[PDB]
Design a protein around this nucleic acid. Sequence first.
DNA 1: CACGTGTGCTCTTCCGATCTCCGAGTGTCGTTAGGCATTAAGCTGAACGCACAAAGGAACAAAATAAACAATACCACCGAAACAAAGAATTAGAATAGTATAACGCTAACAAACATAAATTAGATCGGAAGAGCGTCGTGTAGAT
DNA 2: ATCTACACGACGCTCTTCCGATCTAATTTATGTTTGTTAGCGTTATACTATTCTAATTCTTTGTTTCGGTGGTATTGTTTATTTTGTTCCTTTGTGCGTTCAGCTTAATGCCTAACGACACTCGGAGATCGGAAGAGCACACGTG
Lengths: 87, 84, 110, 110, 95, 95, 97, 98
Amino acid sequence: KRHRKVLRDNIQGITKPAIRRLARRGGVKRISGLIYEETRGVLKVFLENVIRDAVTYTEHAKRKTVTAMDVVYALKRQGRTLYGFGG
Amino acid sequence: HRKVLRDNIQGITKPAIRRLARRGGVKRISGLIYEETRGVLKVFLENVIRDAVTYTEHAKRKTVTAMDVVYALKRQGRTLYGFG
Amino acid sequence: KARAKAKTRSSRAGLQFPVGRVHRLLRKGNYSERVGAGAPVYLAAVLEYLTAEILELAGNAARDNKKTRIIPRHLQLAIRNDEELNKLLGRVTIAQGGVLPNIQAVLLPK
Amino acid sequence: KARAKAKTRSSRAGLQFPVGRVHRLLRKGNYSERVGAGAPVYLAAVLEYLTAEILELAGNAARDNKKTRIIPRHLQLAIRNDEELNKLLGRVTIAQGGVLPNIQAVLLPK
Amino acid sequence: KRSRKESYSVYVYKVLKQVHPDTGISSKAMGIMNSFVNDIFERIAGEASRLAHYNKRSTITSREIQTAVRLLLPGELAKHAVSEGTKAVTKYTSA
Amino acid sequence: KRSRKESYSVYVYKVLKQVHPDTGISSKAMGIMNSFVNDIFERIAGEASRLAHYNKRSTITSREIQTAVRLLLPGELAKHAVSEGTKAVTKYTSA
Amino acid sequence: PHRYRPGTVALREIRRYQKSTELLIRKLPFQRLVREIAQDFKTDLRFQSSAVMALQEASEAYLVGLFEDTNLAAIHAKRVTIMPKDIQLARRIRGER
Amino acid sequence: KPHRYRPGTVALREIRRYQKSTELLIRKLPFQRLVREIAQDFKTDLRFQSSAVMALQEASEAYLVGLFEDTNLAAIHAKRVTIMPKDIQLARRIRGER
DNA sequence: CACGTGTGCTCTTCCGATCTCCGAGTGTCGTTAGGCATTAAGCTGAACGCACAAAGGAACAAAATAAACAATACCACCGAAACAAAGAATTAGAATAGTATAACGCTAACAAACATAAATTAGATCGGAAGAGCGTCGTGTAGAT
DNA sequence: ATCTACACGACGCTCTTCCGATCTAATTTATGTTTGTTAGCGTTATACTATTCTAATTCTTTGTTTCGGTGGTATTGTTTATTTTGTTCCTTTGTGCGTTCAGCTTAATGCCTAACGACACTCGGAGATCGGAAGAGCACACGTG
């Protein structure tokens, strides 16, 4: 009765329309074709920097789950303070 | 001691700004850079010295310590090593 | 035991923000061994002034958008439009807040 | 009163950096009400490792520059050349330290 | 049965009625104002604490809060805040 | 007659002789290493203090220092530092 | 046929997603991406749903601010199209590389 | 016939020399009077320690050198070798100071 | 392009020195030893929420296609900036001198910590309603031709 | 000038989130006592300011002349708008159980206080790496054959 699932190559879920809309909010009119893989790598290293701090925050708490407060503290640690999730 | 200074921004000269630019690796410098750089240095110095005069006014002193400049730079995220 | 008349410390200073809670959060926040009596009154007055400065522009954004209720978009519109509140909250992300309507002048059509 | 043999806490851990002074600076630094016994030993070991990591490259810069004495230029050369010490000290200014010799490849002559 | 979730929600509601008696507020905007007050309290209190640590005082007094407000808040906000603070300190010391 | 100006100068001199027994150091470089130790002590101690404040503990323990080192120091430095810290903690607990 | 000119509905999308306040990434790709990334630091990691919402809001805000800086760095180079060198220059002047 | 170099050669030599050396590049006597002029806006009759004006000089020089490094990056990005006012303004925009 | 010319830096060598290395007090701050308060570790039941699963609608994503517009490559010209010799001028360094101020040292008053009881206030818990989210028709704006 | 696709605008239909009423714990405050922190005043020495003199280093003027920016022209990939068909995401409906999470103990541990002594700081001399100067040599920028 075990179905342990380990994930692989989920960086392609952030689609090119989903990145074009994120650039549309920032005010970008023309987006080159080479933008999307660089943007996925930038988002992946940003999430690595945030998630490593959050997993460190939540294993100092001896919890197996990641709360939203751990993400808030991991974002304040890097000077990217987030409002709307506690604090 | 009745002394008030004015327009000392020209004392930092264009040959004294070309060396500051060539330490940073700038090969060529246009001519509008100099008054702009005097203004940029002026607004940076007004921020840091306003923080330092606030730090030494809280200390009830009439002189500015080097530690007040160090703390005024630490407050802006520009930590300085060499003065305490 | 019979006391005198009870009166909160936020009512003596004419404040809406709690003086006692800010004194408690200063004493249990590990800032110093001692906290003076004028410190929570001063800090609560500064916090009430800042929260009123935010809400007085957020209500104006809500009234400009024909709305009788403040949403996070109104708080973002109040913060990023003020010249000097944007220096206080330049490194702050607001959830469900969006960005200002801001198209560069070179991107507009000809 | 006659005691046992005196032995510093930095000698029990095999450290050069003082355990007692770091414990004093932690207790009088307003960080918590309590500081555990392994905290100053751990922090002094981390500080001695970091100071040795700095000086082991500063001495190499001094020996590369035919010098038997460390100046601030050698500390700046040790910090900004290491890949991971530059992340720890990216927002730090060193006095009399200068910059790295760093000319961009487009500025070099043809 | 659980822990009481302390907040700043009733005070932002009290201030909003003094400013706009016709305008309501959401729950998301109330949480954002909660984090706003909780962040600027942390900024001012930490910078006043390091002000007390620099001058080797062991007391955070109204002077330290005033100097921290002058260091942190920019421009017009700092002098309006020190007026709002000093007038409240005098109104509290008269009573 | 005046106050004794406490520093970290003899310990940077003790460590330099373990590393480079032929190389001396200046006074300016000694002050820079002094400010270096005094700045990273402040970083690690403040971040361990807010770690203890988040999890509502009232004690900064070796776990908080280890987590603060893992949060602050990047890459290879963090694991070399937690080795250097844990081995010193075991060597201190054996004695 | 009523094909528009290139960039017109791009400008309308600029105005619409600047007016909007929603999330632009779908929640199901982003949840699996965070679950993939967090495995390398600890395996069998359950997430609060609000934590993945906070990661999504912060990642989208980071990317929108980086695209604003990228658009400025591309306008400075006398272009309207953002390029990966513009992202690199923005990340370098910002102090991340 | 006299001897003249080409434009950029002595500039590159001074780049290597001032990157190699650690001396201050502005004279101390203009800087003392400029700091004394600036501080009169906030408080008059302010004495200064010599070390305080020295720390201000090192920090201001380091800030200007780092800004000129970012300015040179932003000018190389614009397919130019000289630095212009828009390069300084772009570097200060991306840095998030103005 | 490829070889002679002349310059800037480097290299080698020698002399004061001033900055560094060691020696001798000496307060002061770390170490040690009990002893006491208290914080965190371990075990456990409730339930909260997270993971996994199914099914259908749809909403968004993927793929093909015409094409319009933007990046880039190249070239001509100007105008501005670097380089350099010379004189001015302003800065640097030592030296006198005067002294505001700041860093000490007592002194005390006053302001803040601590404890306890009373009670007022804020958070949780429901519940009624009203701003709003959304579906349908209207003119206007505005963009393409 | 004309036509058509969004986009707000008005109206209406549920709705769900916001606002009011109640209940209770818990956190604030009133009063008093005790302590220990910082303001007040005096002093000294010291470092800051002001000033003279001469040296001398750097700033400013001006005359080249080189090359880099800047505008303009052309071309070819290439990004965008659009339509259609999967495809998977969202929404709901259900289940099971794993991991928070509060609660109750007590064991280890850190704080406290005081005595003692080793250590780092300050002062004070001795020397030696080094800053500066003389002379020569090579890398190298640059200019004719």
